[PDB]
Amino acid sequence: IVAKLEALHERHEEVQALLGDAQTIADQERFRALSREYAQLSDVSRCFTDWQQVQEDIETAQMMLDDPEMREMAQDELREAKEKSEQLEQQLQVLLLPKDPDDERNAFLEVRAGTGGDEAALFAGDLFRMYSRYAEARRWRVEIMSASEGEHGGYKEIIAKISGDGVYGRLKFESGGHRVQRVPATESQGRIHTSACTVAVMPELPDAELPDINPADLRIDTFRSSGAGGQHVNTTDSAIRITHLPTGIVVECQDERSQHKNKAKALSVLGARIHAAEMAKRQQAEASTRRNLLGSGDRSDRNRTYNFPQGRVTDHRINLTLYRLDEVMEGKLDMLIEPIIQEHQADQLAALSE
RNA sequence: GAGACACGGUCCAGACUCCUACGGGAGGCAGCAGUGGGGAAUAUUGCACAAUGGGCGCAAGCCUGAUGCAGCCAUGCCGCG
RNA sequence: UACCCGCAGAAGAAGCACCGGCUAACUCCGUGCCAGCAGCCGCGGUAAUACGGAGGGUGCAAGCGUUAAUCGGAAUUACUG
RNA sequence: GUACGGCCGCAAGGUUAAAACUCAAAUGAAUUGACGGGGGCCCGCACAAGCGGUGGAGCAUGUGGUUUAAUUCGAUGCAACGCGAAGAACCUUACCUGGUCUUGACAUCCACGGAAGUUUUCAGAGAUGAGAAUGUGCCUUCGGGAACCGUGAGACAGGUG
RNA sequence: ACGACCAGGGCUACACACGUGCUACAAUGGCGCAUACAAAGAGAAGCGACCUCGCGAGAGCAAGCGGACCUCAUAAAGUGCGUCGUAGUCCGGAUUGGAGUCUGCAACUCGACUCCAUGAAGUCGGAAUCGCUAGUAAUCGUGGAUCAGAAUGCCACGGUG
RNA sequence: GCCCGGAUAGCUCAGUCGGUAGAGCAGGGGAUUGAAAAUCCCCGUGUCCUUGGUUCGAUUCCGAGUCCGGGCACCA
RNA sequence: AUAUUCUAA
RNA sequence: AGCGUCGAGUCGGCCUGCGCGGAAGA
RNA sequence: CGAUGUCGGCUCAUCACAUCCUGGGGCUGAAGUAGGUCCCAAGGGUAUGGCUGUUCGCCAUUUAAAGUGGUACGCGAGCUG
């Protein structure tokens, strides 16, 4: 975390090379993706320099006078300066806190039973409750589209839309395996069992606007229809082939004797086929996106472990362990989320162009 | 030819490599060393005919990558630090 | 060249595998069904003689392990049996 | 005992008969149990025979849940739920909010300075802080202490974590 | 500071679900008046008589008793006589208003008790389910621990049966 | 494009033809069970597709749409 | 006459 | 208008007449 | 309606220009090469196959280019069927 904020000072000075000189002013293109990079990590740098002024003072705060007598009375002045540097860390949060429009949008919280059968399902229930209680705290509107209840309680699957301002900015990190280690409720011998649940947090995609079939994006071919119908069918351009140039979808229609009916029928079909083909892409995109977020339901594939015996939650990607499980299960998730958002932004502002 | 259907002979055909004045020619490391390649992996383009053997010779000798030796490698066995 | 004699000075010369059982050799720290180990049985899910390091120990030693391959153990193709 | 091939068959199929791959077992008999909607024999308000309740009402009380700054922690089939608690207004109290302390509310150890106690005032929600009178006893080699209070250490105390 | 001190809050929250109790729905009863018959137990910062005052909870004054002595302390169901006459009642006593009492630095959150007023649900409880074999069940009072105060709980005690 | 039928509880369906809607399965609460089913008791559930009329009053009777299903779009 | 089921340390 | 200089007209609306473009086929 | 033979192919065409190529230009978000777009221009030129009765279309491979239309969607007293 501190090592990352050091890497900002590494990419703070090399950029701060040209102000009113002649090197990168030749092309405004490359300069545009450089001057704007400075601005983002400039606010964080100056605030970090203020924190890098207080640390070293602690190694000369123990004894400033020399003899131990007034040192403790003098330390109270440096103790107040330590409380000020604590507020600089409280600011650090706000300077990292993300400002990307994608974070503000709403989110579909999908929770599925991993390995553990009924026990997994009971813990899906405990996770969904934990998110629900976290969603109603900060005051979001959580509502259930699809539930599949387990035999002994909980859910085999629970899909809930969580609606507010900044949902997908705080729940994006819940995606993946959640491993639970406890004596289940479905357990006769008092044995500890290790179940997992998969959580997918997918952001709300702007519904799906079925667009108008622009006639300038059509090639319409008229020609003689095939088969029976005497002189009329010999001589009449009844048959329609509408080729949609964008997609490349082509629909032929010669079911009726009138070109107008055929053309009408073909536009209808070409509509249906264009609108079915794009809704297929969306399903595939969603299916693949979900597949990746979930991972396997196996106990080995996890971002977080909830060990009830020890009352330990341990996020595995930010090697963090808290003995505050009872709190976390009641939906005080800002013990776990905050750090993850810090270390995510620490990387974003460190690696943008590189 | 005593002996071969002949490793470093002949003829034909074939594929491959090379030379060519384009007409035509040349060649065969499964000797020793060595090169490329293949491979988990296997050595020096030494020295000498002094010894033992072989060819020819009356013999002296000449030839002998057989052989005797050296080089390389903990590859093994044995011995010693 | 083998071998012999002289000179100086401990001087120039120790590693490799293993230590849960089978199997000779045990403890501490770290990790927390992860990372990893593993010939078989198995070990590891916050008090690990089994993982990784350390200290100690055992076995081999200019080798030591691993892998491959063969017979053995296998009376598990049995002639012996 | 399957595939492929062969032979047989009207067919159904039979017959002959592999391999890959996979597991560290699979298996036989017997032993101790446990279990059976197996058998036999017994017992207990276990049923039956009775009597009175609970489940509905209002209230008490505990719990789950929900709520909350906090609703402290524990008990959870029988064998948790008027249970730990034989008694939460303060105290208790472990919880929350705010105000405070840092060898420290509670111990031992050392140095320094003071007898304790006694009344009284102000500020403060109180903790606490700042004053002012008021004593300077008890053991005594009248050198020293030990009755307990302050102040400074750093060994540690402290923790219903 | 996950240690320590303090004030004030909270453990008493309330769409709801369950357990354990209490009180009822009445006439084998209610109310009024009169009147019998227990056991067991507690008591010194304690139990507190008598007398006086108060509708009452209580208050004042104060004996006695570390108790087979004094106090708590009137047992109640029962019995006799009266009334009510089957009504949501002269059943039931929730809830709420007003006015008090006492404990306690302090009863707002959050005490118990008293008085006047108020007079809810409830007319014997669906599926179900509990206890009990005799001085038992059922029903009737009585005491104690904890405790300043604060039992319908608990632990004891007799009565009727 | 036209035509016939349909739109009623969460799902599948009755019903009514002017007033005052049901069923089964879901759902909720209780019970039974060591627990989950099955079972048992108690409950709730609808703007009667959307509009614009007629009417004192429309789920019901008109006239539009919308969605669904079933025809048909022919003679040549 | 009717009695199904019990994952995974 | 042209570039303060230069020395008579000048500017763009209205009413209306006739024309111009817009105007490619076997 | 006392008959004006109807698709496509074949053969043979002929005209228009709203130009596919070649010729001449303006503008270009025209550096060059190559394009875009609009104007002028009808002299000449303007695929062969696979599939399908096909017209159309898709596909293969060409070409400077494989124009768009009219002609009883030209052409059965010319062929096919």
Ligand SMILES: [Mg+2]
């Ligand atoms: Mg030869």
Ligand SMILES: [Mg+2]
């Ligand atoms: Mg050769």
Ligand SMILES: [Mg+2]
């Ligand atoms: Mg060679």
Ligand SMILES: [Mg+2]
């Ligand atoms: Mg190689």
Ligand SMILES: [Mg+2]
């Ligand atoms: Mg030679």
Ligand SMILES: [Mg+2]
């Ligand atoms: Mg051993």
Ligand SMILES: [Mg+2]
């Ligand atoms: Mg082997």
Ligand SMILES: [Mg+2]
């Ligand atoms: Mg053998």
Ligand SMILES: [Mg+2]
């Ligand atoms: Mg067979």
Ligand SMILES: [Mg+2]
């Ligand atoms: Mg066969």
Ligand SMILES: [Mg+2]
């Ligand atoms: Mg019975």
Ligand SMILES: [Mg+2]
């Ligand atoms: Mg009740």
Ligand SMILES: [Mg+2]
């Ligand atoms: Mg609790």
Ligand SMILES: [Mg+2]
């Ligand atoms: Mg608990």
Ligand SMILES: [Mg+2]
């Ligand atoms: Mg505990």
Ligand SMILES: [Mg+2]
């Ligand atoms: Mg416990």
